[PDB]
Amino acid sequence: MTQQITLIKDKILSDNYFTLHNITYDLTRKDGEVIRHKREVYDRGNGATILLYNTKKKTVVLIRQFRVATWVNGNESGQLIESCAGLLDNDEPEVCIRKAAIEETGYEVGEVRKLFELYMSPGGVTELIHFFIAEYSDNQRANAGGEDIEVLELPFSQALEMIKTGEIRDGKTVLLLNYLQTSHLMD
Amino acid sequence: QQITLIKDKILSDNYFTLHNITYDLTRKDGEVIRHKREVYDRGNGATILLYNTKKKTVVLIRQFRVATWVNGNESGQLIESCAGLLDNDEPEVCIRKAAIEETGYEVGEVRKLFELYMSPGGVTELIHFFIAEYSDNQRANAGGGVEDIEVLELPFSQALEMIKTGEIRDGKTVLLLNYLQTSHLMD
Ligand SMILES: Nc1nc2c(ncn2[C@@H]2O[C@H](COP(=O)(O)OP(=O)(O)O[C@H]3O[C@H](CO)[C@@H](O)[C@H](O)[C@@H]3O)[C@@H](O)[C@H]2O)c(=O)[nH]1
Ligand SMILES: Nc1nc2c(ncn2[C@@H]2O[C@H](COP(=O)(O)OP(=O)(O)O[C@H]3O[C@H](CO)[C@@H](O)[C@H](O)[C@@H]3O)[C@@H](O)[C@H]2O)c(=O)[nH]1
Numbered sequence: 309m310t311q312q313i314t315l316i317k318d319k320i321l322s323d324n325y326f327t328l329h330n331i332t333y334d335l336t337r338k339d340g341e342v343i344r345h346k347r348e349v350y351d352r353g354n355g356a357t358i359l360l361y362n363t364k365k366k367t368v369v370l371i372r373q374f375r376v377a378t379w380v381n382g383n384e385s386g387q388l389i390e391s392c393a394g395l396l397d398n399d400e401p402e403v404c405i406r407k408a409a410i411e412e413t414g415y416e417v418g419e420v421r422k423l424f425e426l427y428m429s430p431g432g433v434t435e436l437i438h439f440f441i442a443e444y445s446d447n448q449r450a451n452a453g454g455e456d457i458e459v460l461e462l463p464f465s466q467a468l469e470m471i472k473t474g475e476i477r478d479g480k481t482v483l484l485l486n487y488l489q490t491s492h493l494m495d
Numbered sequence: 496q497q498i499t500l501i502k503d504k505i506l507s508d509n510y511f512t513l514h515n516i517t518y519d520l521t522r523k524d525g526e527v528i529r530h531k532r533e534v535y536d537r538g539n540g541a542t543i544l545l546y547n548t549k550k551k552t553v554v555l556i557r558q559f560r561v562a563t564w565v566n567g568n569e570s571g572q573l574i575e576s577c578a579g580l581l582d583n584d585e586p587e588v589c590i591r592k593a594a595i596e597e598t599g600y601e602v603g604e605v606r607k608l609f610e611l612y613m614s615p616g617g618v619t620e621l622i623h624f625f626i627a628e629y630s631d632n633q634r635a636n637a638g639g640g641v642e643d644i645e646v647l648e649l650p651f652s653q654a655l656e657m658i659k660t661g662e663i664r665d666g667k668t669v670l671l672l673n674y675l676q677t678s679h680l681m682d
């Protein structure tokens with residue numbers, strides 16, 4: 309995978325809703341040897357996720373909704389607990405995530421803290437994910453956050469044992485709770 | 496709660512599989528609502544962080560990832576915790592084999608953290624997460640080609656730094672590094 313990446317072919321395998329490409333690239337080695345590779349690349353655009361936490365109560369806000377992709381893959385009920393999250397669409401990550409937060413969780417969020425931007429599945433998915441945390445309070449609650457999306461308010465400690473047992477099993481939701489833990493913000 | 500799969504359509508089956516799934520969802524009323532969702536299925540995998548308590552080092556890898564190349568990773572090169580796809584193998588057999596091919600270590604004992612969905616929007620993938628201690632006495636070769644992957648050993652203080660500089664920017668690697676920290680085995 310060293311150096312010299314010549315792009316050779318970008319074929320669209322499927323462009324219904326999101327896009328599936330087949331990508332042909334060449335890697336050229338130290339000696340000048342050229343090896344051809346072919347890789348499916350699925351482009352659903354980038355996303356952002358936020359973790360709402362509160363230091364007055366030691367609580368965090370998450371959601372739960374039906375994820376069909378997990379229903380077809382081992383998740384019996386299909387419902388999944390997760391940090392609030394949205395696709396970028398036409399929006400910068402901040403705008404994206406503020407709106408996402410107020411549609412899904414019904415909180416008007418103020419100061420945010422960006423953590424990192426991570427690829428979640430870099431083998432075959434372009435998806436970059438913008439991570440945020442922000443503190444919440446009862447003042448910031450505009451509405452209810454309704455889709456089958458249920459808003460969960462629970463102890464930070466509870467959420468942590470749910471990672472332990474399997475009740476929480478989403479990746480971006482685990483990163484975020486683990487970062488809040490290591491941040492000390494909740495102590 | 497009540498879920499019925501109506502139609503599973505194959506949009507692409509060139510190598511991996513892209514499905515367009517129609518399902519009925521019964522609401523908090525008894526209300527039936529129909530959805531269509533693209534679901535990409537590349538199977539599942541397993542990833543392993545290798546750590547040495549004596550040297551306080553970790554082992555990670557650097558390879559080219561086309562999925563990131565087309566979405567913001569200039570050189571396409573990406574640092575990740577060793578991983579492989581399941582290929583009908585059990586997570587532990589998989590990751591044991593992944594470790595020798597990619598890192599050159601026949602790791603002895605192995606610990607299982609959890610299984611997480613990495614991108615539950617439209618990707619099926621479930622990753623099995625691992626850690627295990629390593630030593631030179633476990634090495635045999637220096638990374639082969641199942642590929643030409645590069646093997647980075649580095650100070651575990653540096654790896655954490657790189658997550659903050661965004662030099663490390665892969666979902667499964669951050670988790671792995673973050674969990675190890677929280678676990679304290681490195682103090
Ligand atoms: N027909 C159709 N509609 C879709 C599809 N995917 C999304 N939609 C529409 O878009 C909505 C989803 O909006 P978001 O809240 O932005 O999507 P999300 O699933 O929460 O996405 C976030 O989390 C994912 C899981 O990690 C991330 O992968 C993603 O980037 C994003 O951050 C759905 O209610 C639906 O109307 C699809 O495959 N087919
Ligand atoms: N033609 C073709 N071949 C492929 C494709 N994807 C993989 N292969 C073949 O399978 C090999 C992949 O090596 P693995 O170590 O088994 O998988 P990985 O690419 O490291 O994937 C791991 O990381 C991904 C990203 O986090 C994970 O999504 C995946 O589950 C796995 O754990 C490649 O060298 C290649 O020969 C594809 O889209 N097309």
Ligand SMILES: [Mg+2]
Pocket residue numbers: 392393394412
């Ligand atoms: Mg959402």
Ligand SMILES: [Mg+2]
Pocket residue numbers: 577578579580597
């Ligand atoms: Mg690999």
Ligand code: NA
Pocket residue numbers: 326327351
């Ligand atoms: Na496209």
